[PDB]
Design a protein around this ligand. Structure first.
Ligand SMILES: Cc1nc2nc(-c3cccnc3)nn2c(C)c1CC(=O)Nc1cccc(C(F)(F)F)c1
Length: 288
């Protein structure tokens, strides 16, 4: 267990942000954590409840993951219950809420109104860069979706994996038997039929995140029931190009949605294509 430990006295809870089945999330002041900042804000997950094994296991993984575009783990408070995981506080919450709150249907890091192509591409670009880092570590995510990404000051987007997600977005899961929840709207046919998850099922999910990003957080197949969508995805039927989405981008999506996992573009490729675009000049983009 090679996990940075934090003293409970150094953590002062301010108030709750969110609930999950495995814990509650608080904003907290943390002291003497970063040397530049003798004080500073974090988010703290108290463990609720087999559950303590999970927490130890999550912590170890969160320490190992280190990347500009994967959520940032400060360490744990094991001294006295409840157990606390401490994380970087992301001011703008989850990319879904953020996307919904700056899309046509509805300050400091963002202009008023619909995000423009340039911003949309910078987001997709950041989520792609994260997914490079995990495919690097041969780490299969299995629930990649905008709800599972946070936005910070500067529009820094980071990938995590939340349980607040299975509770706030009950509707993004299909409950099968007792206690299992499947993000079926985000899964490839091989994940659904054979129940096989891989890097290749992750890049399928990336394409769906791309569609989320350019639809300003609409749910994939919102017009379908969970069984209508399973029919739809197994039967090979692809999501429509969103209004705000240039054909050149719908192309990167399509490469994520090849029926045959092997035939899907690598995430390094998709990243390359999107970063290219995100950093192309307004004159190049303005005619996409
Ligand atoms: C559970 C959780 N909940 C969280 N809420 C917040 C949060 C909320 C509001 C504002 N600012 C931050 N941050 N935050 C983190 C990092 C985790 C850990 C996690 O994301 N766990 C995790 C587990 C497995 C895999 C991964 C990863 F691979 F995707 F990174 C993350």
């Amino acid at each position: 267990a090679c996990v940075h430990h934090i003293k409970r006295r150094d953590i002062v809870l301010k108030w709750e942000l969110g609930e999950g089945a495995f814990g509650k999330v608080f904003l907290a002041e943390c002291h003497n954590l970063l040397p530049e900042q003798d004080k500073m804000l974090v988010a703290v997950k108290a463990l609720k409840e087999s559950a303590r094994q999970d927490f130890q296991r999550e912590a170890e993984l969160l320490t190992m993951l280190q990347h500009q575009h994967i959520v940032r783990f400060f360490g744990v408070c094991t001294e006295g219950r409840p157990l606390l995981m401490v994380f970087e506080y992301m001011r703008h919450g989850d990319l879904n809420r953020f996307l919904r709150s700056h899309g046509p249907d509805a300050g400091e890091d963002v202009a008023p109104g619909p995000l423009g192509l340039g911003q949309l591409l910078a987001v997709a670009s950041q989520v792609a860069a994260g997914m490079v880092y995990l495919a690097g570590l041969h780490f299969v995510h299995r629930d990649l979706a905008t709800r599972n990404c946070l936005v910070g000051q500067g529009l820094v987007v980071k990938i995590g994996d939340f349980g607040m997600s299975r509770d706030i977005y009950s509707t993004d899961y299909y409950r099968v038997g007792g206690r299992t929840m499947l993000p079926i709207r985000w899964m490839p046919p091989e994940s659904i039929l054979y129940r096989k998850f891989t890097t290749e099922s992750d890049v399928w999910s990336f394409g769906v995140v791309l569609w989320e990003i350019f639809t300003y957080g609409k749910q994939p197949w919102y017009q379908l029931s969970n069984t209508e969508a399973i029919d739809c995805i197994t039967q090979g039927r692809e999501l429509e190009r969103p209004r705000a989405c240039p054909p050149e981008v719908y192309a990167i999506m399509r490469g994520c949605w090849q029926r045959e996992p092997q035939q899907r573009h690598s995430i390094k490729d998709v990243h390359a294509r999107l970063q290219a675009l995100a950093q192309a000049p307004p004159v190049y983009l303005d005619v996409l």
